């Protein structure tokens, strides 16, 4: 009810847009220019997990200048480390998100192509920069009235070369089953789940728990059983666990997506593949026939490799204190 923002008098809060665990976000008018922005107020220092997720998010948004990744305009610079308790992020205001869109809008096949195309274009530049999102889902794909789509929520992101997730409905089977939880392929799997949801207008694998999630997945793509099917699973315990589950042959996707564009079904088949090494890449998906209306190889940024040190904190195992987290964010804001 009573929300306080200690920010520049140049801004005038308009309305409360959301209140999450992370904190709150309000739309605001930058008085001098009349421009509208979203201002996120975060109080992460008594919530370690959120302080670290906020740090990843700030570093990544500040780094990219891409049409399909949320733009950050500025971050309030605090005046003293001692009284540094709130983080204010000024970013672009987006109208809604793909979750809300799938739940309320009648989408044409053209809408679907356009949304998955933009999603993959963002994934391509991230992957090419050695960034993997790791938690892609419809609610993380922000959208505006003209259908522009921008990726956000890089809290579980990592730089390539346990954890908590809100849901595993969009998580790759090999990620669930093995220690290979940091691949480019896991993001393509999530994109395949998003593409399927656009067609079905409901999640394709809404598991009730860990085992049931795999049961739903395999009930559609087929339960891997042969030494070839399982060649990609290095762990013997994982292969045994898979072998202990009910086993069924793959289900014919066309039957599941009767009135869907055959090219869309082909792209989906290439994304929802158990073996990550056989899964289509973001770049290859962009060149797929289904997306020919929007594909332009001269306008799909490849990215530039970011060194692992970008997220140096991920490579140290000493316990982090409240002060250490404040220092990490402080340092990032001022440099």
């Amino acid at each position: 009810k009573r929300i306080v923002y200690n920010i520049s008098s140049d801004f005038q809060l308009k309305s409360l847009l959301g209140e999450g665990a992370y904190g709150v976000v309000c739309s605001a008018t930058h008085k001098p220019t009349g421009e509208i922005v979203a201002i996120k107020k975060i109080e992460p220092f008594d919530k370690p997990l959120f302080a670290l997720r906020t740090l990843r998010e700030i570093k990544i948004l500040k780094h990219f200048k891409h049409e399909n990744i949320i733009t950050i305009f500025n971050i309030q610079r605090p005046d003293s480390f001692e009284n540094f308790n709130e983080v204010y992020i000024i970013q672009e205001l987006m109208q809604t998100d793909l979750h809300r869109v799938i739940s309320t809008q009648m989408l044409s096949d053209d809408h679907i192509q356009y949304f998955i195309y933009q999603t993959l274009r963002a994934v391509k530049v991230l992957h090419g920069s050695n960034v993997i999102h790791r938690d892609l889902k419809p609610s993380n794909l922000l959208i505006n009235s003209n259908c522009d789509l921008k990726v956000c929520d890089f809290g579980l992101a990592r730089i390539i070369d346990v954890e908590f997730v809100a849901t595993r409905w969009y998580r790759a089977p090999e990620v669930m089953l093995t220690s290979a939880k940091y691949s480019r392929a896991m993001d393509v799997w999530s994109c395949g789940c998003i593409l399927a949801e656009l067609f079905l207008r409901r999640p394709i694998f809404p598991g009730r728990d860990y085992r049931h999630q795999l049961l739903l997945i395999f009930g559609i793509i087929g339960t891997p059983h042969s030494d070839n099917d399982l060649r990609c699973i290095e762990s013997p315990r994982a292969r045994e666990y898979i072998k202990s589950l009910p086993m069924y042959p793959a289900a014919p996707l066309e039957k599941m997506f009767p009135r869907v564009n055959p090219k869309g079904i082909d792209l989906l088949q290439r994304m929802l593949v158990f073996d990550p090494a056989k899964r289509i890449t973001a770049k290859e998906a962009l060149e797929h026939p289904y997306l020919q209306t929007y594909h332009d190889p001269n306008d799909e940024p490849e990215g530039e490799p970011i060194p692992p040190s970008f997220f140096e904190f991920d490579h140290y195992k000493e316990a982090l204190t409240t002060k250490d987290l404040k220092k990490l964010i402080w340092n990032e804001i001022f440099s």
Binding site: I3, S9, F11, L13, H111, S145, C147, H295
Partner: peptide, 19 residues
């Protein structure tokens, strides 16, 4: 200058034809 502000609480176009 930073000041405190308080606040008390409570159409999708067609996609572009060609790229």
């Amino acid at each position: 200058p930073v000041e405190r502000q308080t606040i008390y609480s409570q159409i999708l176009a067609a996609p572009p034809k060609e790229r």
